[PDB]
Point group: D2
Chain length 127, copies 4
Amino acid sequence: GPTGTGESKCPLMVKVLDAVRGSPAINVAVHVFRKAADDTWEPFASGKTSESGELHGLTTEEEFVEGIYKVEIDTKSYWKALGISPFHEHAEVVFTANDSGPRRYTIAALLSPYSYSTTAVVTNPKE
Amino acid sequence: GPTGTGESKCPLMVKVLDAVRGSPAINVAVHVFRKAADDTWEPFASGKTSESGELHGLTTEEEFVEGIYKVEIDTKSYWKALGISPFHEHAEVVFTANDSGPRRYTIAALLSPYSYSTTAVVTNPKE
Amino acid sequence: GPTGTGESKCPLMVKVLDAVRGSPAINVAVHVFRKAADDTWEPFASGKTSESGELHGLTTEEEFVEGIYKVEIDTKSYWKALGISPFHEHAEVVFTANDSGPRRYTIAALLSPYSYSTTAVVTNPKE
Amino acid sequence: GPTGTGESKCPLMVKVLDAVRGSPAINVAVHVFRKAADDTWEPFASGKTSESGELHGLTTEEEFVEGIYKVEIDTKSYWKALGISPFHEHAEVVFTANDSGPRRYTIAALLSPYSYSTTAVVTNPKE
């Protein structure tokens, strides 16, 4: 695996899949932002998906406080490397982190050239 | 509302999209079956999607009685003709229809070589 | 093909579906932005989906010049009004448009409380 | 975890997610069929998803020969337990297993009351 800014009990994980080739989406850049008080997006963590299409160790429990986050997936670069013309500039996921709910957040993204789907799996357990 | 093999107030429509090309999926074969009294699948209607990736005129309100129906979409032929060998043999949609009176059903499918999604839009008639 | 805030040969359309109720998503707020010369998002058009879950009349072929556009769909308001508290704050679609002449763009979105999918259908004009 | 008929290097795994609640789909029945020479479907393996929404140990490498398989997911029961009216009778995935391609097959299914998506991840490595 690759990583981000601080690694611990992995409160946040990203998984990206390729719907064209039926495989993990490898070496895809992912940037995480936290919404700041001035309503701007502050860089928070970043990395590249591993050979199993996952990105772990982006943050730690102490750091992952309640707030608004944005996960940006560089889908355009991914398709370009394959010699395929994509529609989207990138894929963005914006969500609120709340302490009330379950503690691990898994963001999954399924990519096609002209379409994507994203889903959140929120649990108590592990990934 | 007519009666037979045509289109009533089109009680059943199919719409198919291609997530690789960002266009309607044209000339896709569709076969519809109804579960008979003896529990086997009987042929009900068939057609091919048009240039807009839609299929209308499959049945009439009179012919479309209460029952369990299967919509089979020939995805494999579609991809092979494009030079791609896909994962699935076909996409199948199975549902109970009209069990509380006549409804209008739109079955939508979004295709990728290794993934598909299907959604139903159900409307309670009148004109 | 007109000119301004209306609908040319409707160059940009949005369609939103609800995967929980099996119906169009009605009264969903949509905001469109264009990336300005200084790299910031400028307001371009806004509307609400109709009873068929579509939004037409956002722009004209003349106003819809080459550029990077963001379509923001207010999913959170939609679900909350239904008594559900959803995962995402909104769904965002970002793309380059018209970089090889005028095209017609349909942006479709399928909504679930913890997941959404978006697809683009691009057509090369004429009438 | 739960299991199927013979457990080994897990050539076939099933993962099911709930798009309404953003969680694993637990205790969902899954039946696997292999297409027989008479063109009928022979029961092959079955089980219920575990608390992480997965089903492993359905088969072994020796048994998983090339052929046509069907994976049936009992989605209707799942929604009914939640007190939600679903559209589909069940979700079906039909595919050919070939020795040429990568060796592990992961079938994932994302469920909503009126929609589902399925994706195949085929790899050399592990799950």
